[PDB]
């Protein structure tokens, strides 16, 4: 049959050549991830220090990390202890192994969301579409308990409960908390998490691309100059013109 429905092309700010990741949206996205997605997903490759001076100030990131409890060790007696989190810790993981996670989601495994913004065709658009793509099942399709219909998931039936409900959280900045906002914001944040160096890449790219154009014009004038010698010569056999 056909491949999973292609996600629509959403007009995110960062899609233009000279545009950045909107930090205000990324901040709200962290809140959505921490209060909704984190219950079942983990971001193993996202560390708190990645957000310092980029999404949140250093003191704020300390408070966020300290809110969680991690298992460190061993101590001098060879035992494992629990400490508050630090800026060097990865984002907390809800389940200890993949088998524990699967046992808590009807056998389904909540994928790590570290690179999910670029792990599906459509990229960021796939996250926005998926989270806003839950619908009543098509006629003739009946879904068991714990199975929900979504137009963008391959197959149509996803084991993830519809995660975004209006009023689920209160944004610190006062932005109205509606399902579509949370989607736009968590998609933004996960896109940032995938490649936190996105803005450096695009600012240095801007300086390279523009410089390369000036470079093209210099080598072109040079090419035009030296080849004039060749392209305007006159070879005569029985004729002479000066």
């Amino acid at each position: 049959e056909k491949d999973p429905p292609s996600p629509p092309d959403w007009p995110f700010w960062f899609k233009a050549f000279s545009h950045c990741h909107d930090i205000p949206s990324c901040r709200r996205g962290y809140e959505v991830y921490r209060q909704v997605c984190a219950t079942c997903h983990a971001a193993r490759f996202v560390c708190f220090r990645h957000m310092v001076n980029t999404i949140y100030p250093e003191n704020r990131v300390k408070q966020l990390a300290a809110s969680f409890d991690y298992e460190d060790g061993p101590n001098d007696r060879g035992e494992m202890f629990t400490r508050p989190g630090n800026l060097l810790d990865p984002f907390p993981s809800p389940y200890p192994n993949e088998e524990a996670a699967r046992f808590a989601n009807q056998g389904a495994s909540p994928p790590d969301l570290s690179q999910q913004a670029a792990a599906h065709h459509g990229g960021c658009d796939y996250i926005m579409s998926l989270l806003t793509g839950y619908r009543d099942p098509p006629a003739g399709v009946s879904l068991r308990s714990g199975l929900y219909y979504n137009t963008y998931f391959p197959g149509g039936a996803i084991s993830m409960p519809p995660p975004l409900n209006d009023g689920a959280i209160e944004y610190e900045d006062g932005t109205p908390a509606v399902a579509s906002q949370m989607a736009k914001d968590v998609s933004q944040f996960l896109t940032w998490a995938q490649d936190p160096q996105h803005d450096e890449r695009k600012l240095i790219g801007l300086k390279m691309s523009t410089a390369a154009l000036v470079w093209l014009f210099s080598i072109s004038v040079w090419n035009r100059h030296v080849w004039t010698m060749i392209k305007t010569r006159r070879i005569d056999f029985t004729k002479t013109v000066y």
Binding site: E1, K2, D3, P4, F17, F45, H50, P111, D112, S114, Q115, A118, A119, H120, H121, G123, P154, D195, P196, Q197, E200, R201, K202, I204, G205, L206, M208, S209, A212, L213, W215, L216, I219, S220, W222, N223, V226, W227, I230
Partner: protein, 354 residues
Amino acid sequence: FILIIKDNIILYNINDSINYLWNIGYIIMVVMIVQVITGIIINLYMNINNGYKGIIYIIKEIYYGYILRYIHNNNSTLIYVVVYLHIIRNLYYKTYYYNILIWYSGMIMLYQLIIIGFIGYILGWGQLSYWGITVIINLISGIPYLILLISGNYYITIVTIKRLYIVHFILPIILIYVEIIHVYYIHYLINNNIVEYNVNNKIIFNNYILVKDNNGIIFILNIFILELNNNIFIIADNDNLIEINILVTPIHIIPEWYYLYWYSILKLLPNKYSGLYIVVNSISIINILSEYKIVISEYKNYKNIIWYNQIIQYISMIYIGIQLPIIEYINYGRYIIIFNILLLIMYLYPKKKK
């Protein structure tokens, strides 16, 4: 070597009537050097232990590591674009009729390149690369015990990566040596012109041809810089950023775009070996397309109708490869393969006299 350089760069005479399609080769050589350098530098920060996390660690922790990661991936796409365009050119101007030795040296580099690329994507430890080497290794499953020797285990594992990585490190240096054998024949067996005959219109290389060749390479750089930093064209499949799970099969086990012409051949033919064999035919028959001719002519600068239908056959097969294995695409694709053979036969056959 300075005298050698002067003989092959400064006092090297080339016809003044060549187009910009005679600059493609210069670009291959430059982009090839860039791929070796970037590869050696990436390896400074990553090895074979766990590529998935290693690529993440390069793009997030190394300073300007993102540049190295994306250049090495995108410059591969670029290498294969320029090479494939270099072949299309050589077919159009039939630059194999009198310079077969140059053509043979090039084909050797093409074979080496096709192995270098396949194995680089398994170094990323991604789902689509894990399950695409598991499906290409099982084509030599007929030769007894050979799969086990290559893989090093009964399933693809870190053991398979530790060994292919050495082939990926070393084979490019050998390719650079064959590039010298290629430039050796080109300089002895003079290059072909846009005109079928040989004319006294040659000019030195450094003062003219290198200035023009740089205008070309800088044009391509402008475009490659835009892709390198903004991904204007999707040249890398997204499913290689999914951690390897050996239990779940990817949505589609397809190669990278520059192996979709031989992936389709393998998915269209009904017998596995027939497919393998038709993939040998594609890379081998093109090396004897002037051998059976008997007329004093190089079949050059005609309308090249057969050439055009061949270039389109390649593009159309790449399309069928992207598509899922739907029956209607398989039937139409089998006709495109039958058509390629007839077009190839037309190149090969000598002509009788009225």
